Structure formats: C-alpha cells, structure tokens
Design a protein around this ligand. Structure first.
Ligand SMILES: CC(C)=CCC/C(C)=C/CC/C(C)=C/COP(=O)(O)OP(=O)(O)O
Ligand SMILES: CC(C)=CCC/C(C)=C/CC/C(C)=C/COP(=O)(O)OP(=O)(O)O
Lengths: 227, 220
C-alpha cells in the first residue's frame, strides 16, 4: 500500500563491466561495485514497502562465456550465500533462488537449500535471486509439471488454461511483477522473466548498475507511480 | 539486419480525443497508418511484420468488428497480393463465425505463395494464450503416451508457438506512450530489442519507423 504502489520489482543489473572499463579497471572491480549496488537496492526495497525484489543474477545463457567470467560470478554467488544470508535473515528477508539449481554442484545446492530454509518463514521482503535462470526454461518447467499431472491421470489437456500455467511458473505465489528495471543501456528482456512480465511496466535507464542508487530506485518507482 | 518487426499500435483513441473527434475517426486514421507501415516494411526488405490487432481481452459491437475484419480482407487482400505480401492471421480464431474463418483461410491460401513481406495480423491474440495452445498440444501427446513430461524442452515447445517457422522477432515497437508488452508476444520476444515511442499510432510514420530500425541498428 505504499504511495508508489509498486509491490514486486524485477531488475536486470547490467553495466558492471562497462562501469569498470570506463575507469581503466578490470572486470572484477565492476563486480565488487555491483555487489555494493545489490546491497543498496535490497536495503532500499525492504525500507520502501516492496513485497518482492527479483534480481537477474545468472542467466542460463551466461554459462557460455569465459571461465574467468563464469567462475567469478559463481564465486560471488557462493560468497553472497556464505556471507550475506545472516543479514537477510536479520532483516526478516525471505530468500529464494530461482532457476535450474540442479546444474550447480551439490555443494552449492546445499548452501542454497540451507539459505532458503533458514529464511523460509520470514515475512518481510522476498528476495528472489535468479541463478542459472531463463524465462523460457521457467515456462518449460511449469509445463512439465502440468504434463506430469496429465500423466498421473489427474489432468486433462483441454483443462490446461492460462491460470493453470500461471500457478506453476516461478514466483506464482508472489504479487505480480509491477516493474522491470534494466540498467546499462540495453533495451531488451534477454530471456529474463517472460511469462511474468505480460503486464509489467518496462523501464530502461543508461545508468550502469554500480551507479544505480537509492535516488535512481525512487526515480524508477516514481516513473512507475506515474503510469 | 532487422528481419522481423512486431508492432503494438496504441494511440488511436487518444489521437481522436486530441483532434476533437469520435473514436471511430482515430481508427480510420490508424488504418491509414497500417497501410503506410506495411508499405515501408515491404519497400525496406523487412521479412516479417507482425501487427497487434485485437487482444483476446455489446455482443453487437463485436459483430460490427467481425464485419470490419471481413471488410478489411475483402478490400485489402488484392493489394497485399499485388505487392507480393504473404498474409497470415495469428490468434484464437476458432471463435470467429464461419464466414470470417473461411475468408481468413482463402486470404491466406491466396497469398501463401507470395515471396515478399510476410504480414502477420494478430486477431484475438494473447502471448500467454499462444504458449497455452502449444502446451495443450504437448499435453495431448503425453495423454496418448507418446511423450514423457521429461522430454518436453524449450525447442520442442517453441515448435508449438505461433510464428516458429519464421525469422525470430528482432524488434518490438509500441506507439502510444505506454511501456508494456500487454500480453502481446511473450515467448517470442526473449531477445528482441524493445522500442517505445510517445507518437500516437495514427501519426506514426516512415521516419518514426526508421528511427526504430535505427534504435535497433545501435543495439550492442
Ligand atoms: C550473487 C549476486 C547476484 C551478486 C550481485 C553482484 C553483481 C551485480 C554482479 C554482476 C553480474 C554480471 C551481469 C556481470 C557481467 O558484467 P555486465 O554484463 O554486468 O556489464 P557489461 O554489459 O557492461 O559488460
Ligand atoms: C545469493 C545472495 C545471498 C544474494 C544477496 C546478497 C546481498 C548483498 C544482500 C543484501 C543484504 C542486505 C540489504 C544487507 C544489509 O546490510 P547489514 O545487514 O550489514 O545491516 P544494515 O542495514 O544496517 O547495513
């Protein structure tokens, strides 16, 4: 019920590399600065009445990039889980990872499993980290779930409707996505959420993610409130 | 090289109000704009042009609309044909009366062989509805026991969504000022460039359309 009236924001956090290069700095510095930015956005959202914040962390397509780039991201994901989870919990933040977790090594899966569990009963902001995630993959998984009900004999094809598949895509349990923000200048979804953004406001800014701060977040919320 | 362009044509009503006229007037103007956009796409080598006509979303005024569609086909198909355009309608048409469905089939039949622009007219279309249709197909095969839930993957499902036979959509344009897809193509826009403009549809012209291709040409 906050004034901007936005309940679920989703973010494509692009620009980190470009941010570091403008400065003559290597890829890694932009990742350092991007993580600060994630801490800043998460905190902003918990403080401004947002119900859910969904961040595009690692796409299923990203696996096809230089090892130094994959492992760095993985490295940072492992670092966040091992060291930022206690703070999410102390903020009554509920953490969910969305995407094909089966591909991660069983040890990364165990950290994911424990982090979600620790925080599953939290009632504040729901933080969804999309890791090894894709909008098409997401739809495909809800499809197989349905197929399955058709296989066990409980579902009839002709009964499958929009509402039913809407109940089996990731985050079906949260308020619908009201606002998609993409930093970094590019104007495309890039196989981020697709089913879920049917009615979302799409908001593109050239600000590089490491520079995207609380004032830019208000900006985007205000542009949304004026829709 | 932009091969497939998709347009959400919003703004006819606001353009009418803005000109001080009734909604029907904006629509005549909007129609004139469709013609102008189709030509521009054709004279510019675009291979596919998909237009969002009406969403699934007085049982009388629907009728007047089914008759308009008929009117439009009857008056404009000869021209699309001379201009070597292949016409295709996407959307849930089972819902249309018998006469309009047959008129749609003869028009597609008449232009299937054309080798220029493929013009897709989305009538009673929904992005979610599209995926659902593919899903139902897939579900049927599973029921007959010829497909395990585990064998369904993106590629398989993609073969069951509208326009899977054509070049992927590269650019989605929405005139009118709103910044949303509005349940227009969903599955198909995963990688498309998204272009929003405040120009109302009736006013959208050749230069606006080029501006959009320019915005596409400049994507990284
Ligand atoms: C666990 C977790 C999700 C932590 C948050 C830290 C964070 C925002 C990392 C950046 C990830 C990313 C997309 C890097 C690639 O550079 P780039 O594609 O962003 O930038 P570029 O277009 O300029 O090369
Ligand atoms: C995969 C994964 C776990 C991703 C999330 C990573 C991340 C950086 C989350 C931010 C948590 C947050 C807002 C902490 C606040 O700092 P604080 O608790 O130090 O206390 P403060 O509000 O007073 O600064």
């Amino acid at each position: 019920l906050p004034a901007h009236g936005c309940r679920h924001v989703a973010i494509i956090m692009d620009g980190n590399g470009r941010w570091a290069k403008k400065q003559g700095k290597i890829r890694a510095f932009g990742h350092k600065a991007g993580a600060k930015s994630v801490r800043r956005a998460v905190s902003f959202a918990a403080n401004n009445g947002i119900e859910a914040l969904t961040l595009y962390a690692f796409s299923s397509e990203n696996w096809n990039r230089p090892a130094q780039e994959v492992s760095a991201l993985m490295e940072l994901f492992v670092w966040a889980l091992d060291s930022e989870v206690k703070s999410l919990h102390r903020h009554n933040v509920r953490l969910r990872i969305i995407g094909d977790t089966s591909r991660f090594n069983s040890r990364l899966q165990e950290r994911i499993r424990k982090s979600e569990a620790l925080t599953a009963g939290n009632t504040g902001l729901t933080l969804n980290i999309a890791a090894n995630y894709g909008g098409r993959w997401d739809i495909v998984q809800g499809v197989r779930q349905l197929a399955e009900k058709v296989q066990q004999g409980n579902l009839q094809p002709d009964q499958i409707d929009e509402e039913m598949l809407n109940q089996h895509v990731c985050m079906h349990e949260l308020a619908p996505v009201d606002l998609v923000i993409r930093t970094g200048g590019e104007h495309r979804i890039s196989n981020f959420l697709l089913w879920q953004i049917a009615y979302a406001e799409l908001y593109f800014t050239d600000v590089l993610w490491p520079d995207f701060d609380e004032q830019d977040f208000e900006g985007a919320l205000n542009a949304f409130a004026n829709r």
